[PDB]
Amino acid sequence: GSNMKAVCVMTGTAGVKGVVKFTQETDNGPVHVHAEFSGLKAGKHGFHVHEFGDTTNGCTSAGAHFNPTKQEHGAPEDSIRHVGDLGNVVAGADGNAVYNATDKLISLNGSHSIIGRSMVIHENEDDLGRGGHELSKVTGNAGGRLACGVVGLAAE
């Protein structure tokens, strides 16, 4: 009675799309994340899991960053971060991007489960809460939402 794989197809109306795959060996163990994108402008783009798996009104209805530990916005590596903080996806000159990471806070089970929630890639770079701006400690000052998608359970 525990999930070990999840998938997320991300679309929008900006010419940006991608797919994210998650695998979790144990109930509370780390989660391996792998995403692929196309149509992005060269550079870094904020990448986080939002609280709602609702995409009825673009990516706006997805709400804010999944934050069950009630912390401020940070980098994946920080102790003080939103469970949903996954940092930046890097796109090359061709507009394509490959993202890989192993995270210990997100999960496919329990209270920190992202199943049924949304992944969102932003237009600007996530300053990881260090930018010294108004939204730095809240969203990373990453701006608009290019694409998003609900996170669904994947086959064994």
Instruction: Please check if 32 is assigned to a binding site.
Output: no
Instruction: Given the residues 45, 85, 103, 126, select the one marked as catalytic.
Output: 85
The yes-or-no answer on residue 145 being catalytic is yes
The reply on whether position 14 binds its own copies by CB under 8 A is: no
Q: How far is the CB of 61 from its own copies (least distance, A)?
A: 7
Burial 18-45 (b: 16+ CB within 10 A, else e): bbbebbbeeeeebbebebebebbeeebb
The reply on whether position 82 binds Zn ion by CB under 5 A is: yes
Q: Which of 142, 112, 135 is nearest to 48 (CA)?
A: 142
Q: Which of 129, 127, 123 is nearest to 145 (CA)?
A: 123
Q: Which is nearer to its own copies, 79 or 100 (CB)?
A: 100
The yes-or-no answer on residue 133 being catalytic is no
The reply on whether position 79 binds its own copies by CB under 8 A is: no
The yes-or-no answer on residue 82 being catalytic is yes
- Residues 50, 66: contact at Cβ < 8 Å? yes
Instruction: Give dist(CA 37, CA 97) in Å, integer.
Output: 5
Question: Which tokens in the block code for residue 78?
Answer: 């920080």
Instruction: Please check if 34 is assigned to a binding site.
Output: no
Q: Which residues are catalytic?
A: 48, 50, 65, 73, 82, 85, 122, 145
Q: Annotated binding residues, as ranges?
A: 48, 50, 65, 73, 82, 85, 122
Point out which residues bind its own copies (CB under 8 A).
1, 3, 6-9, 19, 51-56, 61, 63, 111, 115-118, 149-155
